[PDB]
Amino acid sequence: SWDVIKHPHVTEKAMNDMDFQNKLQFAVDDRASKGEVADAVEEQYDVTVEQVNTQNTMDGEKKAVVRLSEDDDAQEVASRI
Amino acid sequence: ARSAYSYIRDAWENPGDGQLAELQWQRQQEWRNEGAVERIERPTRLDKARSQGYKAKQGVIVARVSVRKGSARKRRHKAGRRSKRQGVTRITRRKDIQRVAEERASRTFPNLRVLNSYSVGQDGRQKWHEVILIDPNHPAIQNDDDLSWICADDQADRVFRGLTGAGRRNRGLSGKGKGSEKTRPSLRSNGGKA
Amino acid sequence: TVLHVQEIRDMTPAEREAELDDLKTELLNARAVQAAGGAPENPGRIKELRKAIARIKTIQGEEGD
Amino acid sequence: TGAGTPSQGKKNTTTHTKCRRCGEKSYHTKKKVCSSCGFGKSAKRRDYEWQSKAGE
Amino acid sequence: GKKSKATKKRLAKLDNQNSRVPAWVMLKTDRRNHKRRHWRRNDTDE
Amino acid sequence: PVYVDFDVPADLEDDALEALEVARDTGAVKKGTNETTKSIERGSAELVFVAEDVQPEEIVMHIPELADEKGVPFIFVEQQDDLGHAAGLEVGSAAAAVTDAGEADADVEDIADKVEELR
RNA sequence: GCACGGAGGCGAAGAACCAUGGAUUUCCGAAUGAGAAUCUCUAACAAUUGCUUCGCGCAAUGAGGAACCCCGAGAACUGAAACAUCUCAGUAUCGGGAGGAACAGAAAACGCAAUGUGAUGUCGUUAGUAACCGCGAGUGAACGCGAUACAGCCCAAACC
RNA sequence: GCUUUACUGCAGGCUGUCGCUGAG
Ligand SMILES: [Cl-]
Ligand SMILES: [Cl-]
Ligand SMILES: [K+]
Ligand SMILES: [Mg+2]
Ligand SMILES: [Mg+2]
Ligand SMILES: [Mg+2]
Ligand SMILES: [Mg+2]
Ligand SMILES: [Mg+2]
Ligand SMILES: [Mg+2]
Ligand SMILES: [Mg+2]
Ligand SMILES: [Mg+2]
Ligand SMILES: [Mg+2]
Ligand SMILES: [Mg+2]
Ligand code: NA
Ligand code: NA
Ligand code: NA
Ligand code: NA
Ligand code: NA
Ligand code: NA
Ligand code: NA
Ligand code: NA
Ligand code: NA
Numbered sequence: 001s002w003d004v005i006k007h008p009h010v011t012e013k014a015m016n017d018m019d020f021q022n023k024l025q026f027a028v029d030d031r032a033s034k035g036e037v038a039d040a041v042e043e044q045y046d047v048t049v050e051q052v053n054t055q056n057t058m059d060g061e062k063k064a065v066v067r068l069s070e071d072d073d074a075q076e077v078a079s080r081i
Numbered sequence: 082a083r084s085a086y087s088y089i090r091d092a093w094e095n096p097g098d099g100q101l102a103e104l105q106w107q108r109q110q111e112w113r114n115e116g117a118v119e120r121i122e123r124p125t126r127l128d129k130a131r132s133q134g135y136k137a138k139q140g141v142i143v144a145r146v147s148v149r150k151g152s153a154r155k156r157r158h159k160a161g162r163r164s165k166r167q168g169v170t171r172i173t174r175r176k177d178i179q180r181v182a183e184e185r186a187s188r189t190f191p192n193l194r195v196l197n198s199y200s201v202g203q204d205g206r207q208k209w210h211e212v213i214l215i216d217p218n219h220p221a222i223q224n225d226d227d228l229s230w231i232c233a234d235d236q237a238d239r240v241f242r243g244l245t246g247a248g249r250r251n252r253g254l255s256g257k258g259k260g261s262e263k264t265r266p267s268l269r270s271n272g273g274k275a
Numbered sequence: 276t277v278l279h280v281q282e283i284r285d286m287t288p289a290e291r292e293a294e295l296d297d298l299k300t301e302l303l304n305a306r307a308v309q310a311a312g313g314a315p316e317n318p319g320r321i322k323e324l325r326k327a328i329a330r331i332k333t334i335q336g337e338e339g340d
Numbered sequence: 341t342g343a344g345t346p347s348q349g350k351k352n353t354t355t356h357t358k359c360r361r362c363g364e365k366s367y368h369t370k371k372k373v374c375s376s377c378g379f380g381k382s383a384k385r386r387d388y389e390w391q392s393k394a395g396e
Numbered sequence: 397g398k399k400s401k402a403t404k405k406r407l408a409k410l411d412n413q414n415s416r417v418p419a420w421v422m423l424k425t426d427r428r429n430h431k432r433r434h435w436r437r438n439d440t441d442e
Numbered sequence: 443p444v445y446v447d448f449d450v451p452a453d454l455e456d457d458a459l460e461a462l463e464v465a466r467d468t469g470a471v472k473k474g475t476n477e478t479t480k481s482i483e484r485g486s487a488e489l490v491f492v493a494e495d496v497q498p499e500e501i502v503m504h505i506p507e508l509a510d511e512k513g514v515p516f517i518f519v520e521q522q523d524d525l526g527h528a529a530g531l532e533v534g535s536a537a538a539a540v541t542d543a544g545e546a547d548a549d550v551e552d553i554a555d556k557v558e559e560l561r
Numbered sequence: 562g563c564a565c566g567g568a569g570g571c572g573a574a575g576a577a578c579c580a581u582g583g584a585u586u587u588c589c590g591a592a593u594g595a596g597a598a599u600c601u602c603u604a605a606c607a608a609u610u611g612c613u614u615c616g617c618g619c620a621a622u623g624a625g626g627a628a629c630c631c632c633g634a635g636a637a638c639u640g641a642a643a644c645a646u647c648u649c650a651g652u653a654u655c656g657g658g659a660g661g662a663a664c665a666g667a668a669a670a671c672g673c674a675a676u677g678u679g680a681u682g683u684c685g686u687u688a689g690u691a692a693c694c695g696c697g698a699g700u701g702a703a704c705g706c707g708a709u710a711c712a713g714c715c716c717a718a719a720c721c
Numbered sequence: 722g723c724u725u726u727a728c729u730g731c732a733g734g735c736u737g738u739c740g741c742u743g744a745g
């Protein structure tokens with residue numbers, strides 16, 4: 001069975017969202033909905049997801065911009081992996 | 082003594098006389114309102130059905146099929162043709178109506194296989210035939226020594242390949258001698274000349 | 276390699292699922308490091324992590340979990 | 341108006357497209373029928389004996 | 397135009413097939429991309 | 443219907459079927475059109491029954507005249523499964539024949555008489 | 562792996578490799594819950610059938626395959642030094658369908674007429690013979706014989 | 722390709738007959 005999260009989409013823009021808006025960006029399975037992305041992220045990193053934006057990239061994969069709650073620190077979550 | 086069956090048979094030797102005559106005059110009225118293929122609980126001619134392999138048993142089915150009377154329904158040529166091939170009105174098909182009926186029935190019951198068929202009359206514009214079909218997958222038949230032959234894989238779609246009795250006579254295979262030079266073993270192996 | 280078939284067959288249905296999740300995670304993080312261009316790789320592992328996960332799922336199948 | 345070059349300018353309509361069944365760019369999206377494999381018209385795959393020499 | 401999810405995936409794929417043979421493959425075989433499609437000089441499906 | 447040339451009153455049919463039941467327990471009965479036919483042909487038939495709800499009618503059409511030229515008495519019965527049940531069958535029967543009644547010969551004889559009069 | 566790089570890894574816990582068997586096996590596809598250019602919308606044998614506990618409960622069909630095979634539909638160029646019947650040809654092509662082979666098959670046969678043969682295919686021959694035909698051009702068997710292989714049976718009905 | 726009271730045919734239309742079709 002397919003998994004929701006593939007890997008962290010780490011790029012300059014991705015960093016900016018992390019340092020400035022507390023967002024983590026992931027490469028997810030395009031069959032995955034925002035809700036499924038939200039859960040997976042919470043269950044894998046023990047955090048609370050506030051908002052999820054998606055995009056079906058020209059790389060054939062789906063990209064998700066997941067925003068964390070004030071309680072969580074994107075920089076710190078991303079930094080442990 | 083005479084079997085009761087011999088009376089059904091005997092009546093159908095003259096479908097235009099006596100009781101059978103009045104019966105037909107009545108039935109066709111209902112038949113003309115039925116479909117092209119109507120499954121029926123009982124053969125209109127028991128003696129005939131049973132004579133052809135019928136049996137009051139699970140997996141044995143009967144269906145009356147209606148087919149139009151006459152020559153081929155043909156479209157006139159739309160390109161060059163020598164006189165010989167410009168015909169339309171007098172052209173008749175090489176498959177007899179009874180065979181057409183047997184095919185329409187089998188298609189209606191994709192899982193069944195045609196066993197045989199017989200005529201049950203006609204009016205001025207159509208002929209009716211009753212077709213006996215068999216369920217090759219029902220154990221009632223698979224365990225019947227007089228019918229399980231029709232269960233074999235090589236009997237699949239037997240009607241569409243002319244393996245039916247009507248199919249074989251129509252193929253000119255009745256005679257074992259003179260006249261069947263171009264029919265047996267098959268019309269095709271003989272270059273389609275019969 | 277590091278994880279053989281016997282060791283996998285000796286585990287309990289619950290130890291497999293646990294061992295499974297662990298591997299998946301090791302893998303996910305391996306891929307995350309790769310995505311970040313993290314050179315501290317070891318091509319053999321990220322590859323063995325896939326086979327290890329295959330062997331486990333294979334055994335969970337044979338065993339009935 | 342010339343039937344040549346000048347009439348080629350109006351050609352921005354999409355008809356034949358990648359077919360879901362055979363993969364050929366022959367699925368007519370207006371007719372919803374593949375000119376290559378017959379998809380949308382026939383359950384059986386489109387094929388003709390004239391696609392090759394008679395004795396072959 | 398308006399591309400669907402599937403079309404987009406196909407375009408994405410074509411763009412990737414449009415990459416060059418990695419330098420290492422040249423060394424690994426001791427020595428062309430027979431599928432170099434240009435957006436202008438070439439035409440894609442659909 | 444085409445073979446039915448006279449109507450048998452319900453009450454008569456009742457007595458008739460009743461007689462047939464005792465006939466099978468006391469004397470002997472023939473169940474089935476083929477077996478009924480041979481009775482009429484072999485003359486060993488005392489009384490024969492014929493259902494009116496037979497389809498196709500061919501199965502029975504002959505019973506009437508065949509009986510008439512054999513001097514065998516026959517009676518009609520609306521239902522088909524009643525005749526079969528009354529004959530002792532778990533199924534219906536298009537025709538039945540009382541091959542020598544029993545403890546009902548008087549009744550049978552009378553039933554026959556009633557029908558003759560019923561023409 | 563082809564594929565001879567770089568880094569790294571696996572193998573005596575016997576890897577690679579090979580054989581058999583098993584696991585996994587996305588989406589579209591006969592494609593079957595419904596729709597759709599391989600995606601989507603809210604439990605599905607869709608459709609047609611058989612049996613039927615009359616409930617999709619138990620089953621069947623659908624599509625493919627190099628050609629071969631069987632059943633239907635059926636040209637024209639061409640030849641005849643024109644051309645119409647004839648010929649090309651029951652060919653090309655089209656519709657339907659089976660199998661590993663099909664089809665045929667145990668005489669209402671043959672008819673070297675017999676005091677004779679003895680299911681059926683096929684091969685060799687009979688023979689370009691008999692037969693057809695603007696009796697033109699053309700067309701064209703069979704019985705028998707020598708072989709191959711061999712195998713004969715089941716119903717309906719009578720009487721139960 | 723086209724034409725027509727060219728040759729030969731083929732659709733189509735009209736008309737008789739048979740079947741469907743029966744009572745006085
Ligand atoms: Cl069939
Ligand atoms: Cl001889
Ligand atoms: K010609
Ligand atoms: Mg969006
Ligand atoms: Mg053959
Ligand atoms: Mg033009
Ligand atoms: Mg690029
Ligand atoms: Mg679907
Ligand atoms: Mg010529
Ligand atoms: Mg001449
Ligand atoms: Mg010829
Ligand atoms: Mg001969
Ligand atoms: Mg027997
Ligand atoms: Na990726
Ligand atoms: Na069928
Ligand atoms: Na012929
Ligand atoms: Na272009
Ligand atoms: Na596989
Ligand atoms: Na099914
Ligand atoms: Na059902
Ligand atoms: Na010439
Ligand atoms: Na000429």
Ligand code: NA
Pocket residue numbers: 646647694
């Ligand atoms: Na001629």
Ligand code: NA
Pocket residue numbers: 673
């Ligand atoms: Na001789």
